Design a binder for this molecule. Structure first.
Ligand SMILES: NC(=[NH2+])NCCC[C@H](N)C(=O)O
Ligand SMILES: NC(=[NH2+])NCCC[C@H](N)C(=O)O
Ligand SMILES: NC(=[NH2+])NCCC[C@H](N)C(=O)O
Ligand SMILES: NC(=[NH2+])NCCC[C@H](N)C(=O)O
Ligand SMILES: NC(=[NH2+])NCCC[C@H](N)C(=O)O
Ligand SMILES: NC(=[NH2+])NCCC[C@H](N)C(=O)O
Lengths: 71, 71, 71, 71, 71, 71
């Protein structure tokens, strides 16, 4: 249901910062962790932000593309 | 929204305990706080549980019915 | 400190619901727990709401008074 | 592993307040939710406090006894 | 506000790690997110630590400077 | 302690991602912060993931080895 709470997807190097509606970070964090993509080392969620730690910037770009493709 | 994460709605006296999918408590906590129902004194969310503190058991029954009606 | 984030103090029976600025519930929760008032059985904080569980409605009124006196 | 993080168990009416070591509330919240005791309506965890909402004070006393028996 | 809870500001590359008083991470996280500085890609808060993800190490030094200037 | 909730330890560069049982991230976050290892700049915990920000990938390898040695 990413499109229902997704707000913005930014990034730097091997890191992606996914911004969601208030209080929905952990909901997508659950989604992300359940994908278990090899490119994602791990995810950490606060209240409206999800930090996706990827192996490399290239894996980040890849994850970013697959994520935006779900909207 | 609610129907997509709702799992169970229980209660005792003036208290309602809303159970949601893992990591979705704060998402509905935002929904509940946004409704600003006079019956709801306040809400506190953990990871998958939302505690809705109502003024009286009567107000709780009322809130429970309006909540279930959105399912 | 409290006056800097305090927004509203409500209650029912032996329960008090303290509303704070977004993300400041746990800051006050720390304050409350550090007071160790005999009247307060315990505190549970979400994002902007603090549930203060008091022993009796009378202890709740007492706690409410002391809290508002710090504003 | 309750005994490893348990600090104190208090209560009022149908409510129980379980105090744990810092950051361990959700760990026991998981334990409590997995028990699915009929007496427990629900649980809400903060950082070091777990609020156990029981149906009645009698169910609270019962839950309290079973919990302390695990230490 | 920041000076009231600020404890330490560290960093590595494009990342800044802001340490605050216990339970005050999200309070500052709200402050940071409200500044919407172009240098900050995003923020993630735990209990007493705020991770500020900046675009580059240079933007991190900049953000660090502006932050410490508010003390 | 750690062995009782530890699930996986991954990493990239100066970052380590520790995965724990659901709801146990902050319990080990407390453990990590209590160690005050010079290698660890800081830690941020969500629900089941702990992000350990180390100064360099070398420090991360070091921290990773001492962590796994406690298993
Ligand atoms: N209502 C709040 N807690 N706001 C602060 C959010 C801080 C940070 N963006 C996070 O998601 O962790
Ligand atoms: N993954 C977890 N933290 N589970 C424990 C949840 C405990 C309790 N139901 C709460 O929402 O606060
Ligand atoms: N940004 C948010 N997480 N909002 C939801 C808050 C829900 C509830 N009032 C609490 O403080 O736990
Ligand atoms: N480090 C902290 N967040 N302390 C505040 C705890 C507030 C309250 N006792 C709770 O467990 O929700
Ligand atoms: N009382 C606690 N929860 N302590 C653990 C804090 C872990 C980490 N420093 C964070 O802020 O996320
Ligand atoms: N029950 C949950 N909230 N699951 C989502 C966890 C997301 C992420 N691994 C974190 O610990 O922040």
């Amino acid at each position: 249901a990413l499109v229902d709470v997704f707000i913005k997807l930014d990034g730097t190097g091997n890191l992606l910062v996914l911004r969601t509606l208030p209080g929905n970070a952990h909901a997508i964090g659950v989604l992300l962790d359940n994908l278990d993509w090899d490119e994602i080392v791990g995810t950490i969620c606060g209240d409206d932000t999800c930090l996706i730690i990827c192996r490399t910037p290239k894996d980040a770009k890849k994850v970013s593309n697959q994520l935006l493709s779900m909207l």
